[PDB]
């Protein structure tokens, strides 16, 4: 019944960078384990008893604290190192784990390249009508679209996903959907998608007419 | 060589039961404690309990003292979890692990666990049609329950493809979208179709997009 509290919640780093993820418990903890988590696997052991790398660990891991406070640290970040990192404990049962850190990695801003996809036709048979917009191989993450029909703003019709940061190039991509009723579509004539981004100098807008 | 094989993902009517296994390869299945841990997207982690497969003895969380069942059987070197009296919260990822002792840092992959009265619903599948760079995609909307597998011009085309995470309508379904960049030299030449394969209704559709 020990809370462990992990700070940061989410945090970036360049290659090179030392790197450092505290776990806070809410009582005192004898040893403190960690656990690393990539995208769509398992966890895997990393460090058990505090300091101790598992069979694989790379050197420039490590790991400290006592008490209430333990940590983990990276004295070089690298590329493979981007992952979620889980803090544990036995000492008091039940075990606990923690929140999770996440560490992404940084790099130069990227603007996004725009696109704007109308209905298909046999969507629009369906009754219904979803415009995508795409926005593809931007940093950060932090981007703002905006729908606008016939210069209304639009709100609350529209929902955005995100994909992970390309191990390649550590980009984002992004594609909010537009979804409206076939009637409701075709009131309308012109279909915009006004995208904000530290990227951009001045915002992209990509549109179509009806 | 040491892998740690858990069962398939399972759909599960709320009030409902179902038993999930854990096979062991590559390690001596008794001397290793099976535990199992919960994920839920947001939550973190939750440990559920523990068996010691050559005794048979079992602790749990209290959290999960009612809901979980811990079983073993040495033979085929098989943990089992069996969940009970299904609510919404029981739709999560569990893990299957030998955290103790030391010595095998590997988990199972996980098995992943949807708590829904609803009957299972295949995908319909739109194209978002193009027009020296052009993005193309499709639409996989109205699917339930999750996962959903995209696959471009039968695997060739691994370049450039994004599938976007699930994103859950206000319809109570699902819906993705997978984009690819392509020269737009070749499009009239060039044929992209995408493959999309929803296993829990057993569907399979393959649309090809065009400008």
């Known amino acids: 019944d020990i809370v462990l509290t992990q700070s940061p919640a989410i945090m970036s780093a360049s290659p090179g960078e030392k790197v450092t993820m505290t776990c806070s418990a809410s009582?005192?903890?004898?040893?403190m384990h960690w656990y690393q988590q990539k995208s769509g696997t398992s966890p895997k052991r990393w460090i058990y008893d505090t300091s101790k790398l598992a069979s694989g660990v790379p050197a420039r891991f490590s790991g400290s604290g006592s008490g209430t406070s333990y940590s983990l640290t990276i004295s070089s970040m690298e590329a493979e190192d981007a992952a979620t990192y889980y803090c544990q404990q036995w000492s008091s049962n039940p075990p606990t784990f923690g929140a999770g850190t996440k560490l992404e990695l940084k790099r130069t801003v990227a603007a996004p390249s725009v696109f704007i996809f109308p209905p298909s036709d046999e969507q629009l048979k369906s009754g219904t009508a979803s415009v995508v917009c795409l926005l593809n191989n931007f940093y950060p993450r932090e981007a703002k679209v905006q729908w606008k029909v016939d210069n209304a703003l639009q709100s609350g019709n529209s929902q955005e996903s995100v994909t992970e940061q390309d191990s390649k190039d550590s980009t984002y991509s992004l594609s909010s959907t537009l979804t409206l009723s076939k009637a409701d579509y075709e009131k309308h004539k012109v279909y915009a998608c006004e995208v904000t981004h530290q990227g951009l100098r001045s915002p992209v807008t990509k549109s179509f007419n009806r | 060589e040491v892998q740690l094989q858990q069962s398939g993902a399972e759909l599960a009517k709320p009030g409902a039961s179902v038993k999930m296994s854990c096979k062991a390869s590559?390690?001596?299945?008794?001397?290793?404690?099976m535990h199992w841990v919960k994920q839920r997207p947001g939550q973190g982690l939750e440990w559920i309990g523990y068996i010691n497969p050559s005794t048979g003895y079992t602790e749990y969380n209290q959290k999960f003292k009612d809901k979980a069942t811990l079983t073993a059987d040495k033979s085929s070197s098989t943990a089992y979890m069996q969940l009970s009296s299904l609510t919404s919260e029981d739709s999560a990822v569990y893990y299957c692990?030998?955290?103790?002792?030391?010595?095998?840092?590997?988990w199972g992959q996980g098995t992943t666990l949807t708590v829904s009265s609803a009957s299972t619903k295949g995908p319909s599948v739109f194209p978002l049609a193009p027009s020296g760079t052009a993005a193309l995609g499709c639409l996989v909307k109205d699917y339930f329950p999750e996962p959903v597998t995209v696959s471009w011009n039968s695997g060739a085309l691994t370049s450039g493809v994004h599938t976007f995470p699930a994103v859950l309508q206000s319809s109570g379904l699902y819906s993705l979208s997978s984009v690819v960049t392509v020269p737009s030299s070749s499009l009239g030449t060039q044929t992209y179709i995408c493959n999309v394969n929803h296993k829990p209704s057993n569907t399979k559709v393959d649309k090809k997009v065009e400008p």
């Open positions: 692990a030998p955290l103790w002792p030391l010595g095998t840092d590997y």
């Open positions: 009582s005192s903890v004898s040893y």
């Open positions: 590559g390690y001596t299945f008794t001397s290793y404690w």
